[PDB]
């Protein structure tokens, strides 16, 4: 079916949760032996949030090569993403690293350090000019450049320098800052203007490595923000648009990561946004 079409029968049905289990029960399960070696424990914020092996990011360390990080790669709209949990304290400079070593421009941030009274990653980003952060274990420097407080989101230039070459790089982080402590938005419209930031600063774009997106599990949100920029690109490539199916792109995704979207209701919104964004597109 159409998709804005099956939406108002899905509301009208109330079936949503319906939907989404269908979902739950189709998708792919591929082992993650990597994440649950005991000297990994403290690599993983949860313990039922796991990367496949196969999709896996490594760390081009020959110790200890972990991450809790998977590879998206979206053959027909030609986009990859690198989707994460928010970095642990003991892995802030694994986090930095993987940015170094996948030649990433952008970080796609969608928690605050602090939600529903709890700490939900760590503040890995410095927030004074003049107050550094480095990073011993893997021998890197981050610099705050410059930041601009937006009404919904907050833009910062920051500097990377891999102290070991003393090259130096910028990288461009995006804190969606509104998201709500329980549920999802009301309107898409704030979150999809995000994401058309992030498009129009090249971080997606194929002159450079993945994206890295992340929230605290790295499944809800950040599934959200994926699905939603894979579904507009595939309707603007594509002879009929309304051939695009948002449970069959899905599915494709958690064949590199497992469950992305996490609720019925991010589900919904989803559809909402999709739906909304492709509007404004035309
Ligand atoms: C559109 O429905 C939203 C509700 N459904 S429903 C009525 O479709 O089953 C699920 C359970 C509670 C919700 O508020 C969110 C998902």
Not at 44 to 58: L, M, T
Not at 108 to 122: D, P, T
Not at 186 to 195: D, I, K, M, R, V
Not at 245 to 261: A, C, N, Q, T, Y
Request: net charge neutral; with cysteine; proline share 4%.
């Amino acid at each position: 079916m159409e998709m804005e079409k099956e939406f108002e029968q899905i509301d009208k049905s109330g079936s949503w949760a319906a939907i989404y289990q269908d979902i739950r029960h189709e998708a792919s399960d591929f082992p993650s032996r990597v994440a649950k070696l005991p000297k990994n424990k403290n690599r993983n914020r949860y313990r039922d949030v796991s990367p496949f092996d196969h999709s896996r990011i490594k760390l081009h360390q020959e110790d200890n090569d972990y991450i809790n990080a998977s590879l998206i790669k979206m053959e027909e709209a030609q986009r990859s993403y690198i989707l994460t949990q928010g970095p642990l304290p003991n892995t802030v400079g694994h986090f930095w690293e993987m940015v170094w070593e996948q030649k990433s421009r952008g970080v796609v941030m969608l928690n605050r350090v602090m939600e529903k009274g709890s700490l939900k990653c760590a503040q890995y980003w410095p927030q004074k000019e003049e107050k550094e952060m480095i990073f011993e274990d893997t021998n890197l420097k981050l610099t705050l450049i410059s930041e601009d407080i937006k009404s919904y989101y907050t833009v910062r230039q920051l500097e990377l320098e891999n102290l070991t070459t003393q090259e130096t790089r910028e990288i461009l982080h995006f804190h969606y800052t509104t998201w709500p402590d329980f549920g999802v938005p009301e309107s898409p419209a704030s979150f999809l203007n995000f994401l058309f930031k992030v498009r129009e600063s090249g971080s997606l774009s194929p002159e450079h490595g993945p994206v890295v997106v992340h929230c605290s599990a790295g499944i809800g949100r950040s599934g959200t923000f994926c699905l939603a920029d894979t579904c507009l690109l595939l309707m603007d490539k594509r002879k009929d648009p309304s051939s695009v199916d948002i449970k069959k792109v899905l599915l494709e995704m958690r064949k590199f990561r497992m469950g992305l979207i996490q609720t019925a209701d991010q589900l919904r919104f989803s559809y909402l946004a999709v739906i909304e964004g492709a509007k404004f597109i035309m």
